[PDB]
């Protein structure tokens, strides 16, 4: 995260760390039930970079605060049972449908530091996914286009689709939204390397619940003027999400 600040203890209890058993931080992820994690497909599979992670290559770490300490009595580390990538994920061109589900080997237990985020309903999505409304991104990724000691947080405004489109050469899909301040705004912030797969969440003003609207997906550099971070559009892919849990867990 660039230009963010340290998270408060238990501020983002659905925040998950995708950890490679070299033992390294792959990406964030989010807890949506006691057995299901949501992340970016590219965190697992990106053939251009020769990245194709399997169930047995990874570990999921939940309830974490610190990036590197093993937080004895606080975090829980699970083994994956199965990985599901969106059948139409487009890794060949624009990371369209950049989403995967990981089903844990065993249901995790909730605690002050571990709690699932909600998935939006069409109507939550309809009223919140508006240009200028702010969401929150979290992660342990780079601080600069080094690495934080604790979880970072940044609040960012959703930007109008045209503005998104006109900032890049990549073709933008209905499955993506972009967020960030405009050069004029004199407020910065962005996700950065290592933040991928983390949650873009918003707090509903109707029921005071936190909803995960986006997934950290792609961008070009970190916190560049006139550029914006791009996120997977969770609601547009919710059908696929339900389909898998239902058809399998």
């Amino acid at each position: 995260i660039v230009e963010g600040s340290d998270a408060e203890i238990g501020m983002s209890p659905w925040q998950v760390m995708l950890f490679r058993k070299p033992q390294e931080l792959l990406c964030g992820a989010s807890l949506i039930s006691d057995r299901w994690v949501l992340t970016a497909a590219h965190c697992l599979l990106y053939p251009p970079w020769d990245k194709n992670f399997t169930e047995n290559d990874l570990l999921v770490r939940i309830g974490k605060h610190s990036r590197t300490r093993y937080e004895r009595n606080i975090e829980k580390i699970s083994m994956l049972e199965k990985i599901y990538i969106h059948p139409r994920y487009n890794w060949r061109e624009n990371l369209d449908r950049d989403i995967a589900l990981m089903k844990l080997k065993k249901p995790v237990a909730f605690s002050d530091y571990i709690h699932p985020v909600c998935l939006p309903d069409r109507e939550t999505a309809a009223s919140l996914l508006q240009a200028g409304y702010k969401g929150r991104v979290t992660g342990w990724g780079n601080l600069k286009e080094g690495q934080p000691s604790v979880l970072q947080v940044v609040n960012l405004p959703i930007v109008e689709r045209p503005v998104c489109k006109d900032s890049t050469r990549i073709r933008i899909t209905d499955n993506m939204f972009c967020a960030g301040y405009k050069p004029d705004e004199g407020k910065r912030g962005d996700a950065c390397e290592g933040d991928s797969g983390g949650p873009f969440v918003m707090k509903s003003p109707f029921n005071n619940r936190w909803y995960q609207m986006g997934i950290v997906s792609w961008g070009e550099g970190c916190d560049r003027d006139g550029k914006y971070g791009f996120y997977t559009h969770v609601f547009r892919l919710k059908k696929w999400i339900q389909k898998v849990i239902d058809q399998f867990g």
């Binding site: 390294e24 590197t68 093993y70 083994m79």
Partner: peptide, 8 residues
């Protein structure tokens, strides 16, 4: 990274 339990 501080090492993690081996049981994991």
């Amino acid at each position: 990274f501080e090492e993690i339990p081996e049981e994991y």
